[PDB]
Amino acid sequence: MFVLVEMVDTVRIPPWQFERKLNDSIAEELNKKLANKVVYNVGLCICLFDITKLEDAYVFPGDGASHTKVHFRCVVFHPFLDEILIGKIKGCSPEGVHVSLGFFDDILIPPESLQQPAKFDEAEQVWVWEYETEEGAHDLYMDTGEEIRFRVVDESFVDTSPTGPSSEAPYTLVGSISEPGSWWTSN
Amino acid sequence: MEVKDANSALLSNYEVFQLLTDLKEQRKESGKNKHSSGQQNLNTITYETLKYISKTPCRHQSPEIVREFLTALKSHKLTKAEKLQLLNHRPVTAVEIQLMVEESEERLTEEQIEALLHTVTSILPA
Amino acid sequence: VKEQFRETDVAKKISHICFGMKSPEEMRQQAHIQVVSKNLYSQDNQHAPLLYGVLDHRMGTSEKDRPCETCGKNLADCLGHYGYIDLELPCFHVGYFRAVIGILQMICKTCCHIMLSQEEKKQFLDYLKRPGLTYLQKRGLKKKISDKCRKKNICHHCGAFNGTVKKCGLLKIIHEKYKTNKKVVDPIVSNFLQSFETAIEHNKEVEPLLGRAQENLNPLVVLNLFKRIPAEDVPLLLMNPEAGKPSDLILTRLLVPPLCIRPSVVSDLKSGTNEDDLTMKLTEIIFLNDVIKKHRISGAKTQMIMEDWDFLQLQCALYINSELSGIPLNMAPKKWTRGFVQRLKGKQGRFRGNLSGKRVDFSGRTVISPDPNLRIDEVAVPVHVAKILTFPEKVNKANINFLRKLVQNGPEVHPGANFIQQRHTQMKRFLKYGNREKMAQELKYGDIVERHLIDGDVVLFNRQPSLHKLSIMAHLARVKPHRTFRFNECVCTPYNADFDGDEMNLHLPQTEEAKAEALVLMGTKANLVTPRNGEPLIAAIQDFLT
Amino acid sequence: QKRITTPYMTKYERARVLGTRALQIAMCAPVMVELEGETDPLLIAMKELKARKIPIIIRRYLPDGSYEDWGVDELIITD
Amino acid sequence: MTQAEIKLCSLLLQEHFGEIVEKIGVHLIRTGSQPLRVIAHDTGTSLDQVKKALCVLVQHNLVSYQVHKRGVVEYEAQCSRVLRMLRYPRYIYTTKTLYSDTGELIVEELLLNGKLTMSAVVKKVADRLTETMEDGKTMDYAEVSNTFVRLADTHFVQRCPSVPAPTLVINEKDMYLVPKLSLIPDDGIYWQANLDRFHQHFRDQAIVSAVANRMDQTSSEIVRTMLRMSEITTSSSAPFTQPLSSNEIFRSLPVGYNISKQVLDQYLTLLADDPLEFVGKSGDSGGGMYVINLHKALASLATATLESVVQERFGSRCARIFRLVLQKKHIEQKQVEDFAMIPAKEAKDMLYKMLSENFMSLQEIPKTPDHAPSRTFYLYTVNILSAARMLLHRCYKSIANLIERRQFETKENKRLLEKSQRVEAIIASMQATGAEEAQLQEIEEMITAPERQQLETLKRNVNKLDASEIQVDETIFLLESYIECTMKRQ
Amino acid sequence: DLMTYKGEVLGITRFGLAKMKESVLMLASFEKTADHLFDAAYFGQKDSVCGVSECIIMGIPMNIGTGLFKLLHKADRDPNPPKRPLIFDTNEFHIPL
Amino acid sequence: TEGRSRDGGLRLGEMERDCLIGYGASMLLLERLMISSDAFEVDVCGQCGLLGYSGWCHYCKSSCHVSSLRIPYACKLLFQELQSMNIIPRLKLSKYNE
Amino acid sequence: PDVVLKPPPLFPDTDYKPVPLKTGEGEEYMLALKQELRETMKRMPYFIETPEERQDIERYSKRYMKVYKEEWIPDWRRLPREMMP
RNA sequence: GUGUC
């Protein structure tokens, strides 16, 4: 839901589905194709916005289908470096914290959280924050949490492709504690 | 597949909201729910996206108010990208203004900050 | 977790084909296993493959007692792997001999620089660099350049006299240098002659023999003079730099082909195996690779190493052509073997024998008989043949009750199907072992069903001695229980049948796209005049005329 | 835009169009005619051509690379 | 020229210059002369970057250009001039061993900028030297120019062809003038170091060192003197030194050496009556003159290099047979063992191992129009030229492998390196503010044992490889001087 | 006219067919295979498969007769459909600094 | 296979191919030579034209540039036979749309 | 005539070991001289360290990008007149 | 190899 990217690909229409409009068909089979798929570096596709220009169809001898090469713009979720967003924390780990978005269900913050964070999981998941300049503040974070506002940095792109003969998180983000949710910010 | 331009036509979240609201209301009337998993993936994506958008207090703003607020903020300097970065969330607090622009201490003054603050509070409802 | 986008099935076409020769380094890079053993079969419990051998199962399976090793599969989904064999002494090639004797004439043998002038090199290069170049214009350019390189015997870059280059024997190169003329005495030949008497005080049987002592280029000096040639003058030498390179002309690393390309013969006679001639030649040349490495330590003279070297060199060159001319009688084998070009060259080859032939299925042939009770585009097919032949078709909304009745009829009756295929899962099921009453109901839209030959089919009928294009035609099929071929006598002249000993053949199109193409072009009503002159060929015969 | 090609329908294109239509009708395609009770969609593929109800466009390519669009209904069928 | 030199210069221009320029540079070695548009087309690079690469290559006098058929400009890259970038440290050291830091810092910037004016050399040398001193920052321009004149009159830094249509035809003259300076604007005069002079000096050094450790320490002073009088009259191609007599030699001998006339003639005749045959006397009953032979000495040097290579690789017993067959040309297989007392088995083994590596040739002598490998005579002979030319092709791939190994280890411990170097600047600026030993124990234990042990080995490995590189490229220089002398431009 | 458009009067033999046509595997499928294949490997040229024999061997439909043209499906299609107008990106509003 | 004693088929030689060529039919000529005789699906690479396996190359050791095509088994056998004769048929793929 | 079933190693252990190098104060002087020549010509304007840099979105941090772009004067007078940047 | 077209 951040950047709309233009793409081009050939889409074959079934020979029995000729009663529906070619535009409606193409739009439906391009919505079904790129629905919940992650790509190399552009990001994660969400849906289809619209087609720009539609070329003619070709009937190759041998199959009998209809191939059309159309340019379409799909909405991909790819934020930039200095962007603040809110999330609901899934759980805690001794290495960062595991938080999720609405659809994107994998982001984890590293130990770089605050000035005095302490982590220890004896039986449950605990994140405590000590803050002493001249008075005493103790903030406690347990099994679940909501409304954490942070900046998404250290973006990583890993590709999964079959290595060797054919006989797992493609998108990775971290967060810096900015505004834990009373409200106490961090600068 | 081939890509003409990788990063192009940076859009907003309300545009996605408006596009996904009318996308599913006509899909359930027309669609036969024929392909189970292929349609299930799209349904899940759209549902999670619309839920995240509806939890975001930015759905009660039609495009004309967006255009008016953008023309109002066009006035001073702020930034092309920080324009919609500031519109993505509610800047009601003065601390979030300091985090919107990475350096908001030397460029302008805080009085002009509360000015645009009340300008935005007069724009978005609650 | 989220799934990554991936292309469903990569479907592409072939644009063009490029030809090129590989290097031993790339050969080893592609190769999988290195064969060092000559023992084909291990002398243990049963016939079993020996590891690191020529008949190994790591290059691909050829029979059905053992699975594959690289990727677990069977003989259907297995393409093949290659191997590399290192040779002790580099050897000559059988097809790249003319290229080598031409390059030896072009480039020097003392400096490794093409003998041309700076002003002529550019006037050849700009003519070479043209937007339009055919394969014949480069055939004559090498011819034109070899002439100017052979006119001059003294190079302009350095000051050494080369001589000339001609071949001798079968695979032997003698560079004619140190010529002794009777006009003036050259200092180079003088030093050459003074350099030889320093050893003719032990054996006085070479002073009558040194007068024709010259330079004999061996593969060791040839391969190294191909490594000192500049890459600048290669584009002018008419050699594609991206495909090939001048050094890659001497074989020193042999590429073991896949094992699926050389199937083994089995006998129900003696519990016996029979290998391919390629495998036997490989086991014979590997035994020559180990007999030379033993003699250097064991201690041999120059000639006893030289004849083993050139034997190993000739057995590798006779492995591809295998019909080379000018072989010494002591080296000539008496029994005949076929090589790599013998699979290509010949009537029973692979170019016009397999590729052009490609024997067809769903066909037959039977003696013809007269039947003046049919039409011009009709032919009678026996029921026994119609029961064997099947035609696959997909079930539409109009073909539901028409093929349900046929599958209810059965395979033993003439109108009916034998194999049934499902819509999504592509697998065929018999109609003789299973029940027909239940599969008739179990039918969906878009199901392939192969039924027997029915009346009203575009079926091809022809003869074997085809000279003109009207020797093959397409008619409508008709089932008649007489166990013989029948057709009208008027169309006997195009086939030129004599109706006493003629056995004509018949073909059945399988795809629907070709069933409509043989009806409009190869039609009996359409094809009535001949393209030669324009006269109608089908009018009448003797009896009707009388 | 003016056509520089003969208007008569060739048999080479007639056969290929008939084959394509026969292969497409057997793919559960919407028929462009009310057919009689009869199988072998090849037999009814000629019926649509005789009535000029075939939605297929013929693209003729020239040696240089020029494309020419022609309609099956615009072509003249002679037999 | 070949794939080895092209692969070497590719890395040499990728580590010295940039990737874009080295691409066009390597593309200019596969095709001799090509138009600018055709180059920009087939290379795949845009026009601006191609022009940048071309002007970079021209500024370092690495590529030449000529006017062709209509008005076109054909560029040509010479690989021999490119392969001389591995001897820059040796050139600077040879300039610094005779002269002082003046000549070193004058010539080290002439090879990093190619065509440069002397007003710029004096400028930059003066600036750097004033910045080097602490209290007295006074550097005379006259002493900087004095070493420049010493280079100019000894023929070390010459003038490149100046400016005398689609382009201008650069012309060269014999006007090596030194325009009189004006020290606190002279344009159109650029100076450049002369490399053949350095090659001649290295040849004299090698000759005198060989004749030193060969026979005597004193006769090398005499030959170096005989090689000092001919620096002006003799050139590189000339195989025979201009004739010189003993009476003129006794005039110019070192100041700290008192050797009389007849014993000097004694030394000279001992140098003449010598199997090495470096100096040859042509005289009379009265007197005469001596002439130094350069080619027959370079041949001996290359021969000694070949025997050293075969002795280090194969063995001393094997080099013994190599020298035995080099002495007795065209010897036969069974008669080599009656000379060399070596067991027949491993003798034949050594002979075949040598011949299978292209170290020896075998010549055929048949008695029949048929080859008849049985009924023929084989003879073993040695060729010096081809062996030197084939070792030269090995040295280049050796240097290429060394460079690839040196560049390989840097990119696995790279982020570790610029991360440990980033911690260096954190405390380097902190120590200026105030020294905290607690912030020192922070960096004492912040780096782990394998985090600090990697640089320790990497520096040693890089040093070893860069030190082997020079010992290898001196051998190619000693080997390329014997190949070019026998080569006669017809 | 087949043996005169080149400029020389050719005959239909192995040498004449080697001169009139330009395909490697085609010339190899007529007479000696080793010579033509080795010459092609030595030269190292590229061959665009467009002959009937090449298209039959490799498996491409030959572009002679029925394969000379291309069929196009005629259905309800729109080249340039009306796209959704933007409410955010209009550059006369988005003025850079 | 050859012969009736082993239940073989019929042979389609060149003289009968000339009759189909003179007519001008390309669909049936390809249907009864490639579709009904030997239809094989092979895979090669775009970087370097070579016969791979399981969508994987042993020359580049990467499955990025991998594609497939339909070829008769005879042609693939001829390619695998010629590659052992120092004759490598470097192939260049393309899209049928291209 | 014996047969080997286990293939030889890819690195056959050599006959003798390599030779140690010669070292003098001039040798490490030349080593450091080469190590500084490489680093300095890596930091020269002639060395093109700018192939092309792509930037998708513009940021506000434009202060820490003040790179000094001083090309050397190409001296077009003593240069091919056809080539004009 | 034999037999037929």
Add this chain to the structure above:
DNA sequence: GACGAATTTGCGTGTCTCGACACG
């Protein structure tokens, strides 16, 4: 008068020299 250069002609060598089916 005598030597380097280019022309015409006898002689050496390689490739195939239609298709199809059936049986032992």
Add this chain to the structure above:
DNA sequence: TGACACGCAAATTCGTC
């Protein structure tokens, strides 16, 4: 056991030092 297109090579003539 016919077909002639390729090389390979020796006899011979115009020409200029």
